[PDB]
RNA sequence: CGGCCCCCUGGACGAAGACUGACGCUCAGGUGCGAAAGCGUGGGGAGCAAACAGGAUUAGAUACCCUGGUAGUCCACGCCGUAAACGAUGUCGACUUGGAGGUUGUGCCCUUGAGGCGUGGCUUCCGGAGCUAACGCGUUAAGUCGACCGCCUGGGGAGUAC
């Protein structure tokens, strides 16, 4: 919910996901994966990106 | 004691045998097998001069039938 | 074979310093002595010697500051076929005077500052960088 | 910071930013590449090529390599008396001693770069490759040997280095 | 002291070998061959060895942390012995690349090691399966061996104690960007070039390399001892 | 190239290695191809080339020890 | 540049004693001169082979592969010397840490080691100072230089046109 709002409001999102991952590992837990989709930056293709850090079993 | 200059086994581990003489058959046979041919220099670790004059000498000798030229004559 | 002998002096000074050599020797000449004196005092060489009753011969000691080379190049500018002559008013400025031009005036070999100060011109021999 | 010139707070001169991928064996590279030059107007050797997973990190990594293990280089604002004839990887620059009273002319982004680099008045026109990455190397490779002496004894200065060399 | 000449001659009469290969930039401290064996020149070594030890003492008074780096099969006991105790650090199950530049990571992996050693011996991870515990028991052994003689090290070291350069060139390079003074012991194929103080030697003969290092190690370690007793006196004066 | 040299104690299998010393090589090896005069000088002469592997091998024994692979 | 030899003859490598004393360097034009095959006439010609047939392949022996098979290959003399003419790097010369191999003149050595040391020789491995886009070079440079020459200035079309 917090990440989706940034995109909703057409804010630049240059660091936003990277700081999502950082604040979550700063507040607790042992690992996070974030994957973001919805045409990043306004591209006219599908364009995803992702970041996983610590231990996330699958 | 000083100045021996070639007693034995000194300068080199293998002797240079003849240079350019071709009238003795046994001096030549030091580098010719019974199969009837000259040995590569790589295999003996001979030095190149004594081998170069011998190539000439062994052929002078071959052409006079002092040696077999070819394996079919064993 | 020998077509420029102040170029050969120079390359010996250059290479002397690149191989950490203490001294560098070559045949001597009048131009080579008059330069070696201006070079001693402005410390672009450390000292020199002259020897030979039969033929003269030149011994030189290299420039250092800390122990490894500090002079980038020493190259000659007026040479066999492109001899370059300058007037009193147009004597050059070499690295705001941290470097030298060695300058043959009619009054002899000196630096470009004493050559200017007399108000002579002449052949501008060799530069540092 | 440390062995660095009297900069105060950092110069954040970003010249370029890019994103590169082979996409050959497991999808594209998500990483970005960054070019930044960091000076202080008085002379520094700071130049940083960096890369990271995302653009904020690429620039910040590139700036970090531009401010650590840099010597201070002690030229007088825009005047310099002893440059080097710059070559860096086929990209060639040719500075000489000069007034600051004349100003500096340079096209593209280079009149903004030369000023934070402190070498702007001494510069004269480039030749060879016109790659952004190696054309700005004037204050790095062009100062690898230098001085800017203010003493009246400047020609007995090298004499002074010689009798310390004895 | 004169003692620095006694160790150097007693060790150095090995003359090396290293077949006939060697390196031209070492040439001055190399005496000419006696039939395709190389011979070290000791007579050129006596100014060298005396230069090197005198500089060791002055950093003795400055340091908390020593790194002995460059280890090899023939050098392992001498590197273990050179440290003697836990104010002096050494790697003997190998140095690894970036052990100083990424010291952040080392202090994390030491914190993993000491955590699994107290868990393992208490019994804390031994639950679930025996496989899951055993692959851990083995990685803890592997940390225990790799780190055992450096595990306590509270910080970046003051100096670098190099016993061979041939295989450990990265460790030298990175200590130089960290701005650390290097004290080097070189063989015939290594260069004297580009490092601050040299002992000319050779890498063969296990009898020389045990002694060179022992002389170097005694110097710094006993230097610290006599400086340390002075340091105490100097500070208790302040409060009186 | 069963080789004329007689094997110690005669047998139906020739001890072809122990018989040969420099035979077939150069003489009966270049079968059914166009014979050149001077090509050996640049084609064959790789003695310099093999001398490098022999030095390298004598260097690496000391170096595996210095790495502690040994 | 290669059967072996002789007839004619170059150039280089060492080494001492002596001699002359810048008689030097580079070089448009230039005369002389060919790896290989082209090529005219005389002497000669076993095998292989462009071409040419036919097989085999994939539709071209003339893509790929084989077999026959002709000019050719071979010599004497005679005609313009082409290319990948080079460690793809002109010349000659001065200067810049060297070790070791192959192998040779030669002082010294169980010439005990195609070795060592003493000093030249080509030739080759190795890497420093320096140089390079990169490989790579490095005392046989692609280093520091010196003088003078050759030669290049986007590609195709053109090594032809003119």
UniProtKB/Swiss-Prot annotation, chain A:
Belongs to the universal ribosomal protein uS3 family. Part of the 30S ribosomal subunit. Forms a tight complex with proteins uS10 and uS14. With proteins uS4 and uS5 encircles the mRNA as it enters the ribosome, which may play a role in mRNA helicase processivity. Some nascent polypeptide chains are able to cross-link to this protein in situ. In collided ribosomes contacts ribosome rescue factor SmrB. Binds the lower part of the 30S subunit head. Binds mRNA in the 70S ribosome, positioning it for translation. This is Small ribosomal subunit protein uS3. It comes from Escherichia coli (strain K12). The lineage of its organism: Bacteria, Pseudomonadati, Pseudomonadota, Gammaproteobacteria, Enterobacterales. The chain holds residues 118 to 175 of 233 of the full protein.
Curated annotation (Swiss-Prot), chain C:
One of its GO terms (molecular function) is structural constituent of ribosome. One of its GO terms (cellular component) is cytosol. Keywords: Repressor, Ribonucleoprotein, Ribosomal protein, RNA-binding, rRNA-binding, Translation regulation. Transmembrane segments: none annotated. GO terms for biological process: cytoplasmic translation; regulation of mRNA stability; regulation of translation; ribosomal small subunit assembly. One of the primary rRNA binding proteins, it binds directly to 16S rRNA central domain where it helps coordinate assembly of the platform of the 30S subunit. This is Small ribosomal subunit protein uS8. It comes from Escherichia coli (strain K12). The lineage of its organism: Bacteria, Pseudomonadati, Pseudomonadota, Gammaproteobacteria, Enterobacterales.
Swiss-Prot record, chain E:
It comes from Escherichia coli (strain K12). Pfam families: Ribosomal_S2. Required for ribosomal protein bS1 (rpsA) to bind to the 30S subunit. It comes from the Bacteria. This is Small ribosomal subunit protein uS2. HAMAP family: Ribosomal_uS2_B (MF_00291_B). The modification N6-succinyllysine is found at residue 114. Belongs to the universal ribosomal protein uS2 family. Part of the 30S ribosomal subunit, contacts bS1. Some nascent polypeptide chains are able to cross-link to this protein in situ. In collided ribosomes contacts ribosome rescue factor SmrB. The gene is rpsB. The keyword Transferase does not apply.
Curated annotation (Swiss-Prot), chain F:
Residues 42-70 are annotated as: Disordered. Keywords: Ribonucleoprotein, Ribosomal protein, RNA-binding, rRNA-binding. The keyword Ribonucleoprotein applies. Belongs to the bacterial ribosomal protein bS21 family. Probbly involved in recognition of ribosome rescue factor SmrB in stalled/collided disomes; fusion of protein fragments to its N-terminus decreases ribosome rescue in the presence of SmrB. Part of the 30S ribosomal subunit. In stalled ribosomes contacts ribosome rescue factor SmrB. This is Small ribosomal subunit protein bS21. It comes from Escherichia coli (strain K12). The lineage of its organism: Bacteria, Pseudomonadati, Pseudomonadota, Gammaproteobacteria, Enterobacterales.
